[PDB]
């Protein structure tokens, strides 16, 4: 189990595409950037991470991620969250399109991360096998405070259930 132990960042990395209101101010097309999990965690005191099986899938889109977006301002301002990271195995262009369709206007405090080949998600045991050696993320949530995991849990039935992975569950551990 991961709780009360150092966030196992190791050498794992993710990709994301920035979204902004002020680099719309300087119109520009955005490219994927690579972020080191270890750098993200050391730069930010308080980090929420949630994994979802597939960008644009129904449960992820309707029942899971909108809660994190809905509560975002509350999280940053009242609960002192620095980053909310939504993790999928999907390519970073599809993740960015997903984020936009969900109403994300700015990636300063929320980033949709691609975990290519489910490498990081498998390392923490939160993967979902979907057949013939293909892995998506399961559905899960994690809180990291000063580099230490203070909460981590994965759905038993990720395709249907938003319980331990819900923003409501996370809020209680803040």
């Amino acid at each position: 189990d991961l709780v009360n132990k150092k966030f196992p960042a190791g050498d794992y990395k993710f990709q994301y595409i920035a979204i902004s209101q002020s680099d719309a101010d300087s119109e520009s097309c955005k490219m994927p950037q690579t972020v080191e999990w270890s750098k993200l965690i050391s730069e930010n005191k308080k980090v929420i991470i949630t994994g979802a099986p597939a960008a644009f899938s129904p449960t992820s889109t309707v029942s899971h991620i909108p809660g994190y977006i809905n509560y975002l301002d509350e999280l940053v301002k009242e609960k002192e969250v620095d980053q909310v990271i939504v993790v999928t195995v999907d390519n970073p262009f599809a993740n960015q399109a997903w984020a936009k369709s969900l109403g994300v206007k700015d990636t300063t405090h929320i980033k949709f991360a691609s975990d290519p080949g489910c490498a990081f998600t498998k390392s923490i045991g939160f993967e979902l096998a979907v057949g013939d050696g293909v892995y998506w993320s399961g559905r899960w949530a994690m809180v990291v405070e000063n580099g230490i995991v203070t909460y981590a849990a994965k759905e038993t039935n990720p395709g249907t259930d938003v319980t331990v992975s819900s923003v409501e569950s996370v809020l209680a551990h803040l």
């Binding site: 920035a18 680099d23 300087s26 520009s28 097309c29 955005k30 490219m31």
Partner: protein, 104 residues
């Protein structure tokens, strides 16, 4: 004229000028704002002949763009003595003009 840099070695020897202000427009062919700013960079090139102007396609020479931490296009990076002095991100004519004038 704005000269296209097609490889790392071409980029490196463009930077290996010395004293002469070097400007590189990191662009993408599919990018609206890149296409927009291009005719404009040609005009800055005609105006400031004491500076050498170049363009680099981020999808063709991706390792160069990644090393320069270009994550957005257009990005114009300004070099002197082989080292970055400043950069301007976005299709921003005023900021680009000013970045040239104060560094030429």
């Amino acid at each position: 004229m704005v000269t296209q840099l097609k490889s790392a070695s071409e980029y490196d020897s463009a930077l290996a000028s010395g004293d002469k202000l070097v400007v590189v427009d990191f662009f993408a062919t599919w990018c609206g704002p890149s296409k927009m700013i291009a005719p404009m960079i040609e005009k800055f090139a005609e105006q400031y002949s004491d500076a050498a102007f170049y363009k680099l396609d981020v999808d063709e020479v991706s390792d160069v763009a990644q090393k320069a931490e270009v994550s957005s296009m257009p990005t114009l990076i300004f070099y002197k003595g082989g080292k970055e002095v400043t950069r301007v991100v976005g299709a921003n004519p005023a900021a680009i003009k000013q970045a040239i004038a104060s560094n030429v």
